[PDB]
Structure formats: structure tokens, C-alpha cells
């Protein structure tokens, strides 16, 4: 059968609900952002945000809210998943042990019932006595909050009112009560009730509110001083407290729907409000101290505060700092002023957060012809539309080009004492020596000192006493303010050549054979203190600036010839701290001593491509177990440096990596360089504090940005991108986009903001009005936000918008391919468009227009009016395949710049998708399924090979390997269909079989081929996908032996890692439509298997049971080889 493997490339970024409170400790405000399945726990600091613990849960977090029950100083957290699995959590901290403990759980679902229309609503009572839920459209589930629930009990008190819009608990009124916004069959109103837990029944409610605004959307309960409710509607704001009432319809809240809210002040004095256009408001309340104890409301003010991203979270933290969370792109943290700016806004922009948004199209593309590909994702929405470019590794691309191959080292020379100004360098060959200057990206050679212009150098540092160390043949000396005579040439009393020396700012370490020297740097004095000898000759030497910014290092690096040396010394006095000798002909480029912000590690760069994990305490001398990491076939170098700050660590190897961080974790990430041997701390005039890199190739003065796996670059367009294609011959993208415009009375239309559609280098307009006979575009009354689409053609390297092309009025564009058709040697753009009209069913108009971009000018070559909307296009064997309102229409490019229909297919509900490989055609229907359609070229027509019958609502399809077909579903699921083999009749071969089911709890928009890692010429193939929460993952094909290897590991791993919430992983990944709950099969959930790397060995040994291992042969499972399997998978991603 088909066996596949699913991991997560990019963790989901778009946010869903944000709650503040005191979840970590008693007296510390924090923020609890849930995004799709992750639960991030930040903390509110004076500088911004600071993460504490990120927890991934098994389910979509739909409703979360903090609550402090009476009897706990800290608070608790309720989370309800999308599969109705409720949990109650508690943070618990003990030293480095930071754990989340589920206090109660239990699935709460009814057997029968329509789910919802307004989604899932959950409200906590203010007195912390019950937990309400709106789940199944005619019920109100009540969870009685007490210590009695070791598992959560549940009531179902019947709502007599069916279609409830919003619901809250009102504040302190001596009895827990409920507000509604109920849509009557004739009108709509706001009713109340009162829950009796002891009697499971509604008592009498105190408010009536027989008719409220016809588009009332939310309830905002106001607190304990002057309790009540505010009913925000589309056009007006009300207030009710049983007797009194106010109402405003201010002219600010007219053009956008209020969607989010929060309570700014603790006595309800202020309220922020966001909308669907970007605006933040502030609903001020005028507190009227009417009597000696009476607090009543007096006035309702609405103040515009400015434009942010389109919010779905809204949380006020402290000190005028508001967090804005955006599903639709670029969640940002903002600051509210007191006075105003030049535009009247109080919103100060602070640090943002990158969101891949709703990805709607992708393309895997390479722009440096390397083995590593880039991924351009059409991210965002209405004004947050932006292309985002995703790369692995570390992008050192601003680098100077210097022709110095195979150089051993470049060491500084200065005369300015307090500055880095005028730093000259040292050229040190083996047998030759020169002096280098730096003109930024260019170099010059001269003669400056006169000491080392005759013999080579190896190590020349920067002494903190404003001096320098010169190591020439067998002696060291200090350096004055650029002299020509020695300060103090301390000779060696052996008359032997130095094998390997080293230097620092306060100490000199020279190895001559086995004798190891020490110099105490006094001002213009080199005093001898200590000395030691090794049992073999010394291979190399390394000095690291460990502490106090003086150069003092209490530890040493010992490497010996033809023997792995783990000998550890006290480098000033040379006291033996630990003595370990491994053995072997492999030589280490000795030791990198760098603390990765939590523990000091020893990093041994072994020869001919090997790497060990050594961990050392700096005061005792205890080492942990070792671990082999493959690097290459050559001896490697492990260094650290200062790029701009934060003490970055680099691995100079044949597989060059940055060791220092990967989302604050010791995980390697590559660079965009083929091979790195050495590094050089230069002082470039065009690159501040950067370093040059010596290789078997050129020298690259480069710096390193924020270190992460998936480096993301944002090209904003300020309009929603539709699709993305790519020209290989021409160097230009192609982006269909969407601009919102309102209609003018005198003029035609007008836009709302200067997006990157109008602001281009050239524009054009659609002509040849071939839809002129239709009287369907009737005149509209107001400018009620029509859409105008165009074709953005974006530059390759600068990403400037080269050209746009406006289409006809009310003409959407739904498909984009750029291929070659026929023997015409041009390479075109083909845009499949359609004519839309509101107050209308499916459209039957539209056209397909072939564009070309000869020499910076977009040209309309051909056009073909087709009755029906053109949903998806693919190239098919030199022919353009289309998909036009449940009809699959194959074309053929004639010589006379037109098209002739070759064939058609009609057994389709709505043919929305097309995917091809060779001569087979994959069609994704609206309601039915995967559909496989042949093409017999000798017959001139199509042919139905097979068809799946099970009604799955498609989202995205992709052919895997010409036997297995992957599809996506609206029910957030994945499945593989298979063309059948035992074709004993014609009925058993027209029925596709569903082989494999899986709940990837996320909506898949895109599929594409292409890996993101280097082609080093395992698994087979690589399919990435693009979703609505910014979750990129990889789907690839396994081998049938490793399927049973890994699937046996999952069922062992499903008893070790206790997931947060006590949710069975078999229960979450189960295929769950509205009617089927078949358990998940066929796929391998790699994100659980990748978590085996984090488990400790006293628990990994219980993972390794009496199991199997295939190295045809047979062997019991062991620890060190199963962890080798995961790292072979982790290098895919």
C-alpha cells in the first residue's frame, strides 16, 4: 500500500485568541497566545515580550480563558479543542523543571446535533462558579466548576431560542446570569436568564430588551461599579442595565464592522475596539458619581486611534502597550500615546511578528542555480498582502569578493588605541608573508611593520593593554605604537621551530613539539610563569575569551598528533583538571570552548569530517557521553566571534553550519556557502564588525543576521495576492492580485490606499469590449466595495513592481499558468478570468487571455471568450488544459495565435482543480472527490480511468507517484487514493480505493513539489503544502520496511510522552468528517517522531523495547541506531 510521512516545516503563525492574566506566577502579568495548536506563554516586561514555555497541544484551540477560582492564589486555564476535548490546566514551576499539569479533562460532545453557525462560544462566569459553552445549536452546556470534577461533568440546559448570535455572563449581581443576542423569526432582541446549578434549569431573567439593532453582533459586559451590557451593532452602540439606556451612532463607526474588544481599565472605564479595515477605536465611558454611593453611566464617546493590522486579538497589557494579533497578516505590538501625532493617531508602532498568513499559492524556485530552493508564498489579505520568501540556513550574501585562495589567516594591526580606526592586516602564507589593507570591498598590499615582512605568522591578537603579539620563528614579543624595534623578544631556550602557537589579549600559548609555554602579559614585559609538557606532540591550539573581557581563560585546549586528546588543563598554571585519551588516527582541530548561554560545552573539530558532543563543567572536570555528527571528509574548524553582538558561533566545515541558535535551541542551521575552512576578524569600511572567511576559494567579508532556520523576507503589496507563477527565460514573477475600490458618482471608481497596484512603473487597461451586448452591469446606488483585479509582474532581484494590467469591470482572475504551447518559441502568460456579478448564481461568461512580456512591455497576444468561469489551468503535453464550470476543456495553440478545442469532459459537479503528470489528469471536484481522467492521444479524446465515490469536499489535490493521489478536504483532513491493480472486471477498476486517512488539523490550500534542502547528488519525493495559518509541512513517500519501523515506534512513543490535555494521539489524528470517524492509517506523523530527540535516555530506553531492526536481516532495537533514523528524517526537515 501507499505509505507517507508528514512533518511540519514552519510552525503555524496566525493567531487565534489572546488572553492576559497571571498564569505563570502570583505577581507577574503575562500573555497567552494560541495560534493554531501551539500555546505560547510570554511575559510582559518593561522592554517588550519574553517567552517562557511553548506547548503544542493535540487540537485547534478554539476557546481559551483564564480564571482564578476561590482558593488559589494563582489562576487556571480552560482550553476547548476543535474536537470538543476540554481540559483545565495549571502552570507548575520547580527550578529548571517547568511543567503544565492537567487538572481535569473529558470529552464533551453530544451524539446528535447541528454544531453552529456562529462557531464555538465559551464564557467563564465572573464569580468563578461555572463554565458555559455554546456548542450544538439549541443547547447551553454548563460545566460546574468545582474540585468534584476529576473528569468534567456536563449539563445540557436547553436554549428555547435557536439562533443565538453572542452570549456573555453579566457581572456581579449576586446570581450568575446570562445575556444573549437572539435572532427572532420576526426581528431580533436581547433576552436574559439565570442558571440554577442545583436544579439544572433557567430561572427568571431580569432584562427584556424587546428589539435591538438589526445587525447586533456582540455583548460587552461592563463590570462591578456600574454593571450592565453594551451591544455593539453594525451602525450603533447601545447600553442597558435594566432601567437606563443610552445610544450613540457616531459617524466614525460607519464603514467597518467591530469584531474585537477588550477591557482596558479594571473598572470598565475604557474599551478598545478594532474593525475589519485596521482601525482602533476607544469606547470611553463617563463615570457619573450621581449620589453618595451611586455610580451610573452618563456618556458614550468614540475616539479614532489609528490604523493597525486587521486584528482578531486585542489585549491591553500595561503602560499603554496593546498587543494586536492578526490572522490576516503581521501581528504587531503597539503603544498608545497621551498626546497626538501629525495624523491624530496615538498608536505607536513597536516590534512586529512575521505571519505567513493565509497562503493562497506557492512556487518552489531557485535564483542562484544551487541545490537549495526558495519558496515564494502569497501571504496575507486585504491590505496585508505580501509575498514572502522562505530559505533555509543563514543568508550571508552581502559579502566582499577577495581573490585569496588557501590562505592561513589574517590578523589585525592598529595604531589608534581607543578605536577600530585604520586597521591594517597580516598576509601569512606558508613560506611567504605580506601586509594587507582594506578599501571596504577592495584590498591593497603594502609593507608597514618590518618585523614579520620576512617570515610567516600564525596568531596575532589584540592585547587589552593596547599592544600586540608577534610570533615569527621561535619567539614572542610585544608591540609598541607601530614600532620597528622589539619591545621584549622573549626567546625560547630550545632553538626549535614552533609547530603551533596561539595568542590572546592577556596570555601567550605556544606549543613547540610537546613543550607548552606561557607568558604573563605585563605592560612592556613578558614574564614567564608556568610551562607544561604533553605525552605526545601537540596537534593544534585554541584560545577562547571566556570571561571578564580581559582574555583570561581558566581552561585549555589540548590536541595531539595521531591521537584524540580530551586532556583538560588550567591554562595559566597548567593544572590537570581531567585526563581522557580516546585513541585513533583521527586528529582533532582541538577544542572550541564556548558557552551556549546555559552550559559550557567542549566542541572538538575532528579530522576527515567527524564531530563529538562534549559537555564540561568549568570547575570540576566532568564530561558527559559523546555523539557522532557527520560533517564531511575533511578536517573541520569550530570557532566563535562577534558578528554585531550576542557572541555568535560558527562551524567551518564542508557542511558549514551556525551552531549558536535555532529558535533558542541547539540545532544546526546551514549557510549559503559551499565550503568554509577558516574565518578572519577583519575591519571592513563597508561592513562593520564583519568577518572574512578563508576557504579553498575566495574570501568573503560577511556578517550574520538573526539566526533561524526559515529566514523570511517580506515584500508588501498592500492588496491581496491571488496566485504566483514564474518565468524561467524572462526574469520576472507573475502575481494576480485584488484591489478593493468604491464607486464614485461623477468618476468611475476610486481606491482606498496607494497600494502596489497603481504605484508601478507602467500600467495598462483591458480593451476589445467583447461583453458589450449584455445588459447585466446595471447601475449601483452607492460605492459598495467592488473588486478590481490586475496582473502584477514583479522584478526578479529588486522585487519592484514592473507592470500591472487592469482587467475589465467586474472581472475576476482565478487561475494563472505560464508555459509554452506549441512550437512557437515564446514563453507566455496565460490568465484564466471570469465575469462576476453579485445577486447571482454561478457565472457563465469569462475569457482566457494569453500574455507575453517582450522587453519590459506586457502584450495581449490572444483572447478566447468562453462561456463559464475558468477555475484552474495546467500545462498538458504542449497543450493548455482548462477547467470551465464542471467541464475539462483541452486546447491546442494554432499557428495563427488562436485556440482550437480538442476535447471535453462532462461528468463533473464543479471541476475546480487540475494536476497532471505525463498523460494522466487529476481533477478535484466540488463535492465528490479525487477524479482520475485519462488522455489517449491516438483516440483524440479523454477517457475515465477511475473515480472515487466518497463525497469529500475538496480543497487541494496533488499527484504523488502516478499510482497514488493525495487530496485535501474542508474537514481539515488528508487522504491518499490509489489506482487499483486487481482489475478482474470493469467495475472493480473504475473505483478508486482510499488508502490512508489522517487529520492534519489545518486547511490545505496549496501543494507543490520541490525540497527546501540541498541536493547532495531515505524517503522518496517531497511535497510541501500551504495553509491558512502559515503552517508549511512536508509530505513524502516512505519505503514499506521503514513504515513498519516507524509505526511501531509511534505506538511505543504514545505511552511515554504525556501530552498536555491527556489527549490520545490516535484520537486527534483520526479522520473526522461530519459522518465518519475512521481511525487514522497510512501516514506517519513525523512531528511526534521528531520529538524523540528531546526525550531523555532514562525514558528513551523504555521506547526501545524488544523491537525489530533491518540491519533482509534481523536485529533487536538499540538506542543509538533508532536515534540515527530520526536524524536521517530530520535532515529532510
Amino acid at each position: 500500500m501507499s505509505y507517507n510521512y508528514v512533518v511540519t516545516a514552519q510552525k503555524p503563525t496566525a493567531v487565534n485568541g489572546c488572553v492576559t492574566g497571571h498564569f505563570t506566577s502570583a505577581e507577574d502579568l503575562n500573555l497567552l497566545i494560541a495560534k493554531n495548536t501551539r500555546l505560547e506563554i510570554y511575559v510582559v516586561t518593561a522592554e517588550g515580550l519574553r517567552p517562557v514555555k511553548e506547548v503544542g497541544m493535540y487540537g485547534k484551540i478554539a476557546v481559551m480563558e483564564l480564571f482564578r477560582p476561590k482558593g488559589e492564589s494563582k489562576d487556571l486555564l480552560f482550553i476547548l479543542t476543535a474536537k470538543y476535548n476540554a481540559c483545565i490546566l495549571e502552570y507548575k514551576q520547580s527550578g529548571e523543571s517547568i511543567d503544565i499539569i492537567t487538572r481535569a479533562h473529558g470529552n464533551v460532545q453530544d451524539r446528535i446535533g447541528r454544531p453552529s453557525e456562529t462557531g464555538i462560544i465559551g464564557i467563564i462566569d465572573p464569580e468563578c462558579r461555572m463554565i458555559g459553552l455554546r456548542l450544538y445549536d439549541g443547547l447551553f452546556k454548563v460545566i460546574p466548576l468545582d474540585r468534584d470534577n476529576k473528569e468534567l461533568k456536563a449539563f445540557n440546559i436547553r436554549l428555547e431560542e435557536l439562533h443565538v448570535i453572542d452570549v456573555k455572563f453579566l457581572y456581579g449581581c449576586q446570581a450568575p446570569t446570562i445575556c444573549f443576542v437572539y435572532q427572532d423569526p420576526q426581528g431580533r432582541h436581547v433576552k436574559t436568564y439565570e442558571v440554577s446549578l442545583r436544579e439544572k434549569e433557567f430561572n427568571k431573567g431580569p432584562w427584556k430588551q424587546e428589539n435591538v439593532e438589526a445587525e447586533a453582533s456582540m455583548v460587552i459586559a461592563v463590570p462591578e461599579p456600574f454593571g450592565g451590557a453594551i451591544i455593539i451593532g453594525q451602525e450603533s452602540i447601545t447600553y442597558h442595565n435594566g432601567d437606563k439606556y443610552l445610544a450613540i451612532a457616531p459617524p466614525i463607526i460607519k464603514q467597518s464592522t467591530i469584531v474585537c474588544h477588550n477591557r482596558v481599565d479594571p473598572n470598565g472605564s475604557r474599551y478598545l475596539l478594532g474593525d475589519m479595515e485596521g482601525r482602533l477605536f476607544m469606547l470611553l465611558l463617563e463615570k457619573e458619581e450621581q449620589m453618595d454611593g451611586t455610580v451610573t453611566l452618563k456618556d458614550l464617546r468614540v475616539e479614532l486611534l489609528g490604523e493597525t493590522s486587521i486584528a482578531e486579538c486585542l489585549t491591553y497589557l500595561d503602560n499603554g502597550v496593546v498587543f494586536v494579533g492578526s490572522r490576516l497578516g503581521d501581528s504587531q505590538l503597539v503603544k498608545l500615546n497621551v498626546d497626538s501625532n501629525e495624523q491624530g493617531s496615538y498608536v505607536v508602532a513597536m516590534e512586529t511578528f512575521t505571519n505567513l498568513g493565509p497562503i493562497v499559492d506557492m512556487c518552489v524556485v531557485d535564483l542562484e542555480r544551487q541545490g537549495q530552493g526558495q519558496l515564494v508564498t502569497c501571504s496575507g489579505a486585504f491590505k496585508e498582502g505580501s509575498l514572502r520568501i522562505i530559505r533555509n540556513g543563514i543568508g550571508i550574501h552581502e559579502h566582499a569578493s577577495i581573490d585569496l585562495p588557501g590562505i592561513k589567516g589574517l590578523w589585525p594591526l592598529r595604531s589608534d588605541p581607543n578605536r577600530e580606526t585604520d586597521d591594517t592586516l597580516v598576509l601569512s602564507f606558508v613560506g611567504q608573508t605580506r601586509v594587507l589593507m582594506l578599501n571596504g570591498e577592495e584590498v591593497e598590499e603594502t609593507e608597514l611593520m618590518g618585523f614579520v615582512d620576512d617570515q610567516q605568522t600564525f596568531f596575532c591578537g589584540n592585547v587589552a593593554h593596547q599592544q600586540l603579539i608577534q610570533i615569527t620563528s621561535a619567539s614572542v614579543r610585544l608591540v609598541s605604537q607601530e614600532p620597528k624595534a622589539l619591545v621584549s623578544e622573549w626567546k625560547e631556550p630550545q632553538a626549535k621551530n614552533i609547530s603551533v602557537a596561539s595568542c590572546n589579549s592577556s596570555q601567550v600559548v605556544v606549543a613547540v613539539g610537546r613543550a607548552l609555554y606561557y607568558l604573563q602579559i605585563h605592560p612592556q614585559e613578558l614574564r614567564q610563569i608556568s610551562h607544561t609538557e604533553m605525552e605526545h606532540e601537540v596537534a593544534c591550539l585554541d584560545i577562547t575569551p571566556l570571561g571578564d573581557s580581559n582574555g583570561l581563560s581558566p581552561l585549555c585546549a589540548i590536541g595531539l598528533w595521531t591521537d584524540i586528546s580530551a586532556r583538560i588543563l588550567k591554562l595559566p598554571s597548567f593544572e590537570l583538571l581531567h585526563k581522557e585519551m580516546l585513541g585513533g588516527e583521527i586528529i582533532p582541530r582541538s577544542i572550541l570552548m564556548t558557552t551556549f548561554e546555559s552550559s559550557h560545552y567542549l566542541l572538538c573539530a575532528l579530522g576527515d569530517g567527524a564531530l563529538f558532543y562534549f559537555g564540561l563543567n568549568i570547575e570540576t572536570g566532568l564530561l558527559s557521553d559523546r555523539k557522532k555528527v557527520t560533517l564531511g571528509t575533511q578536517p573541520t574548524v569550530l570557532r566563535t566571534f562577534r558578528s554585531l553582538s550576542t557572541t555568535n558561533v560558527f562551524a567551518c566545515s564542508d557542511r558549514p553550519t551556525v551552531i549558536y541558535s535555532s529558535n533558542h535551541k541547539l540545532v544546526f542551521s546551514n549557510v549559503n556557502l559551499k565550503e568554509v575552512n577558516y574565518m578572519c576578524p577583519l575591519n571592513s569600511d563597508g561592513y562593520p564588525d564583519s568577518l572574512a572567511l578563508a576557504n579553498n576559494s575566495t574570501l568573503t567579508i560577511g556578517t550574520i543576521d538573526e539566526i533561524q532556520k526559515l529566514h523570511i523576507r517580506t515584500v508588501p503589496l498592500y492588496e491581496s495576492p491571488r496566485k504566483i507563477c514564474y518565468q524561467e527565460v524572462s526574469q520576472c514573477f507573475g502575481v494576480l492580485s485584488s484591489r478593493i475600490e468604491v464607486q464614485d458618482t461623477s468618476g468611475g471608481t476610486t481606491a482606498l490606499r496607494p497600494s502596489a497596484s497603481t504605484q508601478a512603473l507602467s500600467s495598462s487597461v483591458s480593451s476589445s469590449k467583447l461583453f458589450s451586448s449584455s445588459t447585466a452591469p446595471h447601475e449601483t446606488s452607492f460605492g459598495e466595495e467592488v473588486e478590481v483585479h490586475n496582473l502584477l509582474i514583479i522584478d526578479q532581484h529588486t522585487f519592484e513592481v514592473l507592470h500591472a494590467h487592469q482587467f475589465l469591470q467586474n472581472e475576476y482572475a482565478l487561475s494563472l499558468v505560464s508555459c509554452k504551447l506549441g512550437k512557437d518559441p515564446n514563453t507566455y502568460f496565460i490568465v484564466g478570468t471570469a465575469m462576476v456579478y453579485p445577486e447571482e448564481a454561478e457565472p457563465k461568461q469569462g475569457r482566457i487571455v494569453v500574455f507575453q512580456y517582450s522587453d519590459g512591455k506586457l502584450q495581449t497576444v490572444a483572447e478566447k471568450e468562453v462561456k463559464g468561469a475558468v477555475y484552474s489551468m495546467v500545462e498538458f503535453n504542449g497543450k493548455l488544459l482548462a477547467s470551465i464550470n464542471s467541464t475539462v476543456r483541452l486546447y491546442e495553440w494554432t499557428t495563427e495565435k488562436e485556440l482550437r478545442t480538442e476535447c471535453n469532459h462532462y461528468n463533473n459537479i464543479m471541476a475546480l482543480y487540475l494536476k497532471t503528470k505525463g498523460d494522466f489528469i487529476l481533477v478535484g471536484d466540488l463535492m465528490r472527490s479525487v477524479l482520475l481522467l485519462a488522455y489517449k492521444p491516438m483516440e483524440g479524446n479523454f477517457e475515465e480511468i477511475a473515480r472515487d465515490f466518497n463525497p469529500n469536499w475538496m480543497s487541494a489535490v496533488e499527484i504523488l507517484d502516478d499510482d497514488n493521489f493525495l487530496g485535501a478536504e474542508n474537514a481539515f483532513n488528508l487522504f491518499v487514493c490509489q489506482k487499483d491493480s486487481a482489475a478482474t472486471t470493469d467495475e472493480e477498476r473504475q473505483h478508486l480505493q482510499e488508502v490512508g486517512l489522517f487529520h492534519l488539523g489545518e486547511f490545505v490550500n496549496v501543494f507543490c513539489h520541490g525540497s527546501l534542502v540541498m541536493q547532495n547528488l531515505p524517503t522518496q519525493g517531497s511535497v510541501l503544502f500551504g495553509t491558512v495559518n502559515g503552517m508549511i509541512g512536508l509530505v513524502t513517500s516512505l519505503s514499506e520496511s521503514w513504515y513498519n519501523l516507524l509505526l511501531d515506534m509511534q505506538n511505543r512513543l504514545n505511552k511515554v510522552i504525556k501530552s498536555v490535555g491527556k489527549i490520545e494521539h490516535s484520537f486527534w489524528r483520526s479522520f473526522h468528517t461530519e459522518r465518519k470517524t475512521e481511525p487514522a492509517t497510512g501516514f506517519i506523523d513525523g512531528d511526534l517522531i521528531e520529538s524523540f530527540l528531546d526525550i531523555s535516555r532514562p525514558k528513551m530506553q523504555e521506547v526501545v523495547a524488544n523491537l525489530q531492526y533491518d540491519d533482509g536481516m534481523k536485529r533487536e532495537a538499540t538506542a543509538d541506531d533508532l536515534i540515527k533514523v530520526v536524524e536521517e528524517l530530520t535532515r529532510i526537515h
Binding site: 476589445s768 458589450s772 449584455s774 483524440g940
Partner: protein
């Protein structure tokens, strides 16, 4: 694969002394293959129509030619390729099909009337139609009919001259339908461009052969009857 195109090219008369009978029993084979466009395109592309337009006019094999020309124009747009040629090709088509409707072999009207019901989409067909006698040949077919001659309707009573004659009047009403459904859109172009004159119109007209009969009596052939009331 086996060259059934080329063999059926051979079996029709090319300056040859065959029988009438084999050729007529071959054209029926030719018409059944012409339903596939892939056969029908390359039949036009090697010029099979000019081969087919060489038959002597009094012939029992003319009925098969009347079948093939209707099956040529039925589903495939091979007739789109019949437009641009050595000039007299359609001038051979219009001169042929208007005769074999007129001479009225007993099923010769059953196809040549169905031929123009589809071929009135192409405007070059209609232009040559009025260049010949046209409705003088077409309305005279209805005014010949004996179901309609009330003075002679009680003379012939057998089912052969009634079931076919109540079918002959059926197809000619559809031929008059698809005639005036086309000229309604011809003269609407000569009103939306002659009276508007850039006020709601674009003056681009290189005279292409284009199917513009608007094809919808439910919506837009109905709608053209309303919009003509802003006429002259």
C-alpha cells in the same frame, strides 16, 4: 493508423468511370467517420471538400454528398476552416447546397435544410445567400407544399406524401428561424454602431468569420427584440 483517411480519399470518384452505386455506398462510410473531428480536420486539411465538390449534379450519389456536408458541419468546426480557401470554395458550397434543396430529392431536403440551420452562424454563408435567390428559393418551398394547398389537400392521402410533407414544413420553419435569428444580430450591429458612434461602443471591425447568432432565445434573442425599439 492503417490510412483509412487515404483509402476513403481514393474511393470517391476522381475523373473516373466507376458506378454510381459503390461511391454512394462509400460516402455513407465517409460520413460515419466524419463525426470524429480528428478525422474531419485532416479531411479538410488535405482538401477533401473540393474533392467532394466534383460530383455530377443529377446523381443518386448526391444524397451521400448531402449527408457528408451535414455531418461535416454538425459538431466540429471544420467549417471554420472552410472559410479561408481558394476563393470559390464556399461559392461551390452555396451553389451546391441551394440546388439540392431546390431539386428536392425525397430526403435531399431533409439534410440541406438542416445544413443551413447550423451554417447560418458564419456570416460569409449569409452574404452569399442573398447574392443568390435565397428566400425566393426558400419561401417557394413552403408555398409548394400540399398540406398547405387547401384547394389540393383532399387529393393525395397516402402516408408517404404526408408524414414526409409534415416533416418538410417542420424543418423549413427552423431554417427560417435560424435565418432571422442571425439577421437580427446583423442589423443590431448596424444600429449599435451607426447610432451610438463611440457613445457606448468601440469601432473595431476587421470583418472576421464569427459565430454571433447569440444562441439563446430564452434570454438574449428575446433581449435583442427589446433593444431594437431604440431603432431608426
Amino acid at each position: 493508423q492503417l490510412g483509412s483517411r487515404e483509402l476513403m480519399m481514393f474511393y470517391i470518384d476522381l475523373k473516373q468511370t466507376n458506378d454510381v452505386l459503390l461511391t454512394f455506398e462509400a460516402l455513407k462510410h465517409l460520413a460515419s467517420l466524419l463525426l470524429h473531428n480528428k478525422f474531419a480536420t485532416e479531411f479538410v486539411a488535405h482538401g477533401g471538400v473540393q474533392k467532394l465538390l466534383e460530383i455530377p449534379r443529377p446523381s443518386m450519389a448526391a444524397t451521400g454528398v448531402s449527408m457528408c456536408l451535414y455531418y461535416l458541419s454538425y459538431n466540429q468546426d471544420a467549417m471554420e476552416r472552410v472559410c479561408m480557401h481558394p476563393h470559390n470554395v464556399l461559392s461551390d458550397v452555396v451553389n451546391y447546397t441551394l440546388w439540392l434543396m431546390e431539386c428536392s430529392h425525397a430526403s435531399g431536403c431533409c439534410h440541406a435544410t438542416m445544413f443551413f440551420s447550423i451554417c447560418f452562424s458564419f456570416r460569409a454563408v449569409l452574404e452569399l445567400f442573398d447574392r443568390y435567390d435565397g428566400l425566393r428559393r426558400l419561401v417557394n418551398l413552403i408555398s409548394t407544399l400540399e398540406i398547405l394547398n387547401l384547394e389540393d389537400q383532399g387529393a393525395l392521402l397516402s402516408d408517404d406524401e404526408i408524414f414526409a410533407s409534415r416533416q418538410t414544413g417542420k424543418h423549413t420553419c427552423m431554417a427560417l428561424r435560424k435565418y432571422f435569428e442571425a439577421h437580427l444580430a446583423i442589423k443590431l450591429e448596424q444600429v449599435k454602431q451607426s447610432l451610438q458612434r463611440t457613445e457606448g461602443g468601440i469601432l473595431v471591425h476587421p470583418q472576421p468569420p464569427y459565430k454571433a447568432c447569440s444562441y439563446t432565445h430564452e434570454q438574449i434573442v428575446e433581449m435583442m427584440e427589446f433593444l431594437i425599439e431604440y431603432g431608426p
